């Protein structure tokens, strides 16, 4: 089984995301209420996870700095961003912060399934 | 200070674009630039030696399904290799494809020396 950490600062959004990830396959899903900036401070344990999924709602400079610090300290961790922002500039920022995939919000189960099978290969 | 430590491989099937790119990479700093005429689809077959390089630059002039498969196979087999794509295509969809194939930076074509300098200093830190 693949071990996935799902993160958001909105519990009702987080619950929804974790269910869809569960419906996508036989993965081991874990939920956390918090920003990337907050997971950076409690970094003790991220080595257990294969995929990190961050809900890119209030995506700014501090959050991108936190994802860059997370991806750089945990190379075996595939970071994915769930955002409604489809701009080239935001994608470029995410890419430069070490994000290896970006899923659209609202989440499409076909898109998510394909995304999780790509990360499962590595 | 010492950039001569950074080994860059520059690749394109178009010798004219390749020469130009390698020239600008040289002007960007004291890096060790190596040129290769060919697609990523061809570099995947001649994989013997990529462990020597820190940055791989691919010309998006030949960007298709086979190239994206080749870049994904290259990036996955060489994690210490930073892959960069030089493309004129600024679409969100192409960026997303590159990202998904393991491309860690995308530079516009025609190449802007300020953009390139910033991009190469970003990859040089890691």
The residue among A103, A110, A100, A111 whose CA lies nearest residue A51 is A100
A95 closest CB neighbour out of B90, B99, B126: B99
All residues of chain A having their beta carbon less than 8 Å from the beta carbon of residue B106 are 92, 95
- Pairing label, strands A3-8, A28-33: parallel
A11-23 helix and A109-121 helix, angle to the nearest 10 degrees: 70
Does residue A118 sit at the B interface (CB-CB below 8 Å)? Answer: yes
Quick one: CA dihedral B9, B12, B15, B17, positive or negative?
A: negative
* Nearest residue to B47 (alpha-carbon basis) of B81, B22, B23, B13: B81
Residue A86 to residue B102, Cβ atoms within 8 A: no
8 A C-beta contact, residue A36 and residue A9 = no
Q: In Å, how far from its chain's centre is CA B59? A: 7
> What is the distance between the alpha carbons of residues B106 and B68, in angstroms, rounded to a whole number?
14
The shortest C-alpha distance from B72 to chain A (Å) reads 10
Burial zone of B105 (CB within 10 Å; 0-12 exposed, 13-18 middle, 19+ buried): buried
Flag if A87 and B92 touch (Cβ within 8 Å). Answer: yes
Of A75, A91, A98, the CB nearest to B95: A91
Contact B106 A87 (CB under 8 A): no
CATH architecture of the domain with range B4-126 = 3-Layer(aba) Sandwich (3.40)
Experimental method: X-ray
Q: Do A95 and B102 touch (CB under 8 A)?
A: no
Give the whole-angstrom CA distance, residue A9 versus residue A38: 10
For the domain A2-122, what is the CATH code? 3.40.50.2300
A4-36 exposure pattern, b = at least 16 Cβ within 10 A, e = fewer: bbbbbbeeebbebbbebbeebeebebeebeebb
B60 near A CB under 8 A: no
| Cα distance between residue B46 and residue B40, in whole Å | 10
Q: Which residues from chain A sit within 8 angstroms of residue B126, using beta carbons?
A: 72
- CA of A83 vs chain B CAs: smallest distance (Å): 13
- Please answer whether residues B24 and B108 qualify as being in contact, where contact means their C-beta atoms are separated by less than 8 angstroms: no
């Amino acid at each position: 089984m693949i071990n996935i950490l799902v993160a958001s600062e909105d519990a009702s959004r987080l619950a929804h995301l974790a269910r869809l990830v569960g419906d996508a396959g036989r993965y081991r899903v874990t939920r956390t209420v918090g920003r990337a900036a907050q997971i950076v401070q409690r970094t003790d344990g991220l080595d257990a996870f294969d995929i990190l999924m961050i809900d890119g709602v209030a995506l700014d400079t501090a959050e991108l700095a936190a994802i860059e610090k997370l991806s750089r300290l945990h190379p075996g961790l595939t970071c994915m961003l769930v955002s409604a922002d489809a701009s080239s500039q935001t994608l470029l920022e995410a890419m430069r912060a070490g994000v290896r995939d970006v899923l659209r919000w609202p989440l499409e189960p076909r898109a998510l399934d394909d995304a999780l099978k790509r990360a499962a290969s590595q």
